[PDB]
Amino acid sequence: MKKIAVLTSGGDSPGMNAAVRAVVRTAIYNEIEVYGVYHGYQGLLNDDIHKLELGSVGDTIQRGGTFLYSARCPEFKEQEVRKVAIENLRKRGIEGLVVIGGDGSYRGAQRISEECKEIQTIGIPGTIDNDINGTDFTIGFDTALNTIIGLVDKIRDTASSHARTFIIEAMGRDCGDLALWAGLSVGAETIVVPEVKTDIKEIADKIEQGIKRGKKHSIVLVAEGCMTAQDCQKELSQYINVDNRVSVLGHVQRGGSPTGADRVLASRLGGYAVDLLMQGETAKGVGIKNNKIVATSFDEIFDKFDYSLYELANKLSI
Annotated binding site for ATP: 11, 72-73, 102-105
Give, rounded to a whole angstrom, the gap between the first and last alpha carbons of the chain.
57
SS3 at position 126:
strand
73 interacts with ligand ANP by CB under 6 A = yes
**56/125 with CB nearer ligand ANP:** 125
Q: Which does 107 bind (CB under 5 to 8 A by kind): a copy of itself, ligand ANP, none?
A: ligand ANP
Q: Which does 260 bind (CB under 5 to 8 A by kind): ligand ANP, a copy of itself, none?
A: a copy of itself
Breaks (C-N over 2.5 A) in the chain follow: 303
Pick out the residues of the known binding site: 11, 21-25, 72-73, 102-105, 127-129, 156, 164, 171-173, 187-189, 213, 215-217, 224, 245, 251-254
Sign of CA dihedral 21, 26, 31, 34: negative
**Phi, psi dihedrals of residue 97, rounded to the nearest 5°:** -125, 125
Q: Which does 184 bind (CB under 5 to 8 A by kind): a copy of itself, ligand ANP, none?
A: a copy of itself
**114/311 with CB nearer a copy of itself:** 311
137 interacts with ligand ANP by CB under 6 A = no
**67/239 with CB nearer a copy of itself:** 67
44 interacts with ligand ANP by CB under 6 A = no
Active-site amino acid positions: 129
206-265 residues near ligand ANP, rule: CB under 6 A: none
**27/301 with CB nearer ligand ANP:** 301
Angle CA 100–267–45, to nearest 5: 25
140: left (phi over 0), alpha (psi -120 to 50) or beta: left
105 interacts with ligand ANP by CB under 6 A = yes
Q: What is the amino acid identity at position 7?
A: L
Distances (CA, A) of 281 to 120, 161, 297: 7, 58, 10
Report d(CA 256, CA 299) in Å as an integer.
Answer: 33
**Selection from 121, 122, 123 nearest residue 102 by Cα:** 123
Angle between helices 16-29 and 260-278 (to 10 degrees): 40
**25/254 with CB nearer ligand ANP:** 254
Q: Point out which residues pair with 35 in neighbouring strands.
A: 5, 51
Q: What is the amino acid identity at position 299?
A: D
Pick out the residues of the known binding site for Mg(2+): 103
Angle CA 173–138–250, to nearest 5: 40
Can you give the three-state secondary structure of 218-234, one letter per residue?
A: EEEEEECCCCCHHHHHH
**Least Å distance between CB 60 and ligand ANP?**
20
Region from 8-16, 146-154, 274-282, 308-316 binding ligand ANP, contact rule CB under 6 A: 8-16
129 interacts with ligand ANP by CB under 6 A = yes
Q: By rule CB under 6 A, what count of residues binds ligand ANP?
A: 20
65 interacts with ligand ANP by CB under 6 A = no
**108/258 with CB nearer ligand ANP:** 108
**Selection from 267, 255, 253 nearest residue 57 by Cα:** 267
Q: Which does 102 bind (CB under 5 to 8 A by kind): ligand ANP, a copy of itself, none?
A: ligand ANP
Q: Which member of 8, 16, 34, 41 binds ligand ANP (CB under 6 A)?
A: 41
- Which residues contribute to the site for a copy of itself (CB under 8 A)? 21-22, 25-26, 29, 54, 61-62, 136, 142, 145-146, 149, 153, 181-182, 184-187, 259-261, 263-264, 267-268, 271, 289-292, 309, 312, 315-316, 318
**Selection from 98, 14, 125 nearest residue 61 by Cα:** 14
